[PDB]
Amino acid sequence: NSIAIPTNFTISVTTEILPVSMTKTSVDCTMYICGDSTECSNLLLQYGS
Amino acid sequence: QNAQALNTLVKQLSSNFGAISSVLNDILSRLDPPEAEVQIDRLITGRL
Numbered sequence: 029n030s031i032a033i034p035t036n037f038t039i040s041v042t043t044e045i046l047p048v049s050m051t052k053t054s055v056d057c058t059m060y061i062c063g064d065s066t067e068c069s070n071l072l073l074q075y076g077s
Numbered sequence: 078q079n080a081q082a083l084n085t086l087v088k089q090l091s092s093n094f095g096a097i098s099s100v101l102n103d104i105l106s107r108l109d110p111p112e113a114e115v116q117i118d119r120l121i122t123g124r125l
């Protein structure tokens with residue numbers, strides 16, 4: 029037979045932070061793996077796609 | 078995206094990966110087992 033009823037209130041503003049995107053890197057395979065070498069660039073073609 | 082993943086997986090069978098031929102039957106027609114196993118391990122590793 030007991031109830032508690034609030035007689036006043038507080039307006040609280042609470043921050044929420046969410047990730048939405050991330051840095052759009054691109055790493056070119058041939059320039060990463062070989063870089064200017066034609067010898068390496070030809071060996072890397074044997075590994076296909 | 079599924080069709081492009083399967084097409085890429087199938088086109089990789091044609092790659093050498095460092096073996097003398099990308100065809101398993103070429104290695105086994107051309108080479109005897111002691112040297113053939115060296116060419117086949119390159120294809121196994123690349124295909125795996």
Ligand SMILES: *[C@@H]1O[C@H](CO)[C@@H](O[C@@H]2O[C@H](CO)[C@@H](O)[C@H](O)[C@H]2NC(C)=O)[C@H](O)[C@H]1NC(C)=O
Nearest residue numbers: 031032033034035036037038039040041042043
């Ligand atoms: C409900 O609460 C607010 C505060 O949360 C009360 O207003 C404050 O009351 C105190 C004490 O009188 C003052 O010092 C403040 O200046 C008032 N304003 C604020 C914004 O804090 C309000 O009186 C309460 N009402 C009830 C139902 O008791």
